[PDB]
Design a binder for this molecule. Structure first.
Ligand SMILES: CCCCCCCCCCCCCCCC(=O)O
Ligand SMILES: [Cl-]
Ligand SMILES: [Cl-]
Length: 174
């Protein structure tokens, strides 16, 4: 009976790009089809004077045949009418790395502790998402405090994803 229509999902009110800048460690991920970033995922968010948000990311990716590489990715965000919803153009510093353009929603954050991100790449005909991914980010690479963990779990459930996350390990591979 819970609403899993993407159009129903709440996102961060009055999202503040400047407060969001800096280092975010991925603690958990819900994978999309043909997943790219595997683990050791660390993102760096910036804003320029124009107010344009951008980011970089490091992480182990596993090209099939069991070949691991540390991908180095770049993203630039185009604003929409909702301050928490963006279009993210992304590519790798190496051109053979995956490129594309995904929706990028900041579903919730408190800026200094946790963030929950969401992207629906493709809708179902009933408004639910056919192909989604989601990152949970922490400022501390050792994980979230209990109060933040509990908030995040609630958001995960609201996105209809709470059963579908896996933990992201950080072991200095990159
Ligand atoms: C959304 C993650 C951090 C945002 C920074 C964007 C920098 C480019 C990272 C590309 C993410 C594309 C891969 C996401 C889906 C996946 O990993 O399977
Ligand atoms: Cl709990
Ligand atoms: Cl669960």
């Amino acid at each position: 009976e819970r609403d899993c229509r993407v159009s129903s999902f709440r996102v961060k009110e009055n999202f503040d790009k400047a407060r969001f800048s800096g280092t975010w460690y991925a603690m958990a991920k819900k994978d999309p089809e043909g997943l790219f970033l595997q683990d050791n995922i660390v993102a760096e968010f910036s804003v320029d004077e124009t107010g344009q948000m951008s980011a970089t990311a490091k992480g182990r990716v596993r090209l099939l045949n069991n070949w691991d590489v540390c991908a180095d990715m770049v993203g630039t965000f185009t604003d929409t009418e909702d301050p928490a919803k963006f279009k993210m153009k992304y590519w790798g510093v190496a051109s053979f790395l995956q490129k594309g353009n995904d929706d990028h929603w900041i579903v919730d954050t408190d800026y200094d502790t946790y963030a929950v991100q969401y992207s629906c790449r493709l809708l179902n005909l009933d408004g639910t998402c056919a192909d989604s991914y989601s990152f949970v980010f922490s400022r501390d690479p050792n994980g979230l405090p209990p109060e933040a963990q509990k908030i995040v779990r609630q958001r995960q459930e609201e996105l209809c994803l709470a059963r579908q996350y896996r933990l992201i390990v950080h072991n200095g591979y990159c």
